């Protein structure tokens, strides 16, 4: 019966003909983003681990 595109990260759903690219754009909008290098992560990626990534850009001296 699945007549819609399910977002995998939230509860939303879309017309089955919903602009693929716009849908990719939706999905991307949940991702966490490193403010220095822009790497992206699952929204639920561990916050400690995530912060450690950011910090490393500094600790390292880029
Ligand atoms: Cl740590
Ligand atoms: Zn979503
Ligand atoms: Zn980064």
PDB file of C-alpha atoms in Angstrom, residues 10-50:
ATOM      1  CA  UNK A  10      11.089  11.983  10.894  1.00  0.00           C
ATOM      2  CA  UNK A  11       7.405  11.180  10.649  1.00  0.00           C
ATOM      3  CA  UNK A  12       6.716  13.067   7.422  1.00  0.00           C
ATOM      4  CA  UNK A  13       5.455  11.517   4.162  1.00  0.00           C
ATOM      5  CA  UNK A  14       5.336  12.739   0.570  1.00  0.00           C
ATOM      6  CA  UNK A  15       3.467  12.470  -2.701  1.00  0.00           C
ATOM      7  CA  UNK A  16       4.884   9.395  -4.438  1.00  0.00           C
ATOM      8  CA  UNK A  17       5.845  11.734  -7.270  1.00  0.00           C
ATOM      9  CA  UNK A  18       7.460  14.267  -4.950  1.00  0.00           C
ATOM     10  CA  UNK A  19      10.509  15.961  -6.484  1.00  0.00           C
ATOM     11  CA  UNK A  20      13.335  13.572  -5.632  1.00  0.00           C
ATOM     12  CA  UNK A  21      15.840  16.329  -5.152  1.00  0.00           C
ATOM     13  CA  UNK A  22      13.529  18.294  -2.858  1.00  0.00           C
ATOM     14  CA  UNK A  23      13.153  15.099  -0.845  1.00  0.00           C
ATOM     15  CA  UNK A  24      16.880  14.637  -0.559  1.00  0.00           C
ATOM     16  CA  UNK A  25      16.943  18.230   0.579  1.00  0.00           C
ATOM     17  CA  UNK A  26      14.386  17.499   3.251  1.00  0.00           C
ATOM     18  CA  UNK A  27      16.318  14.570   4.597  1.00  0.00           C
ATOM     19  CA  UNK A  28      19.558  16.517   4.728  1.00  0.00           C
ATOM     20  CA  UNK A  29      17.797  19.060   6.932  1.00  0.00           C
ATOM     21  CA  UNK A  30      17.901  16.743   9.968  1.00  0.00           C
ATOM     22  CA  UNK A  31      21.644  16.054   9.715  1.00  0.00           C
ATOM     23  CA  UNK A  32      24.087  17.491  12.236  1.00  0.00           C
ATOM     24  CA  UNK A  33      26.784  19.635  10.667  1.00  0.00           C
ATOM     25  CA  UNK A  34      30.291  20.306  11.752  1.00  0.00           C
ATOM     26  CA  UNK A  35      30.620  24.127  11.736  1.00  0.00           C
ATOM     27  CA  UNK A  36      34.291  24.006  10.696  1.00  0.00           C
ATOM     28  CA  UNK A  37      34.530  21.420   7.888  1.00  0.00           C
ATOM     29  CA  UNK A  38      30.841  20.784   7.192  1.00  0.00           C
ATOM     30  CA  UNK A  39      31.003  17.030   7.606  1.00  0.00           C
ATOM     31  CA  UNK A  40      27.450  15.769   8.263  1.00  0.00           C
ATOM     32  CA  UNK A  41      26.169  13.156  10.695  1.00  0.00           C
ATOM     33  CA  UNK A  42      23.107  11.212  11.566  1.00  0.00           C
ATOM     34  CA  UNK A  43      20.833  13.374  13.680  1.00  0.00           C
ATOM     35  CA  UNK A  44      21.160  10.865  16.505  1.00  0.00           C
ATOM     36  CA  UNK A  45      24.948  10.449  16.256  1.00  0.00           C
ATOM     37  CA  UNK A  46      26.414  10.583  19.811  1.00  0.00           C
ATOM     38  CA  UNK A  47      26.736  14.190  20.987  1.00  0.00           C
ATOM     39  CA  UNK A  48      29.990  13.554  22.859  1.00  0.00           C
ATOM     40  CA  UNK A  49      31.535  11.932  19.785  1.00  0.00           C
ATOM     41  CA  UNK A  50      30.215  14.763  17.604  1.00  0.00           C
TER      42      UNK A  50
END
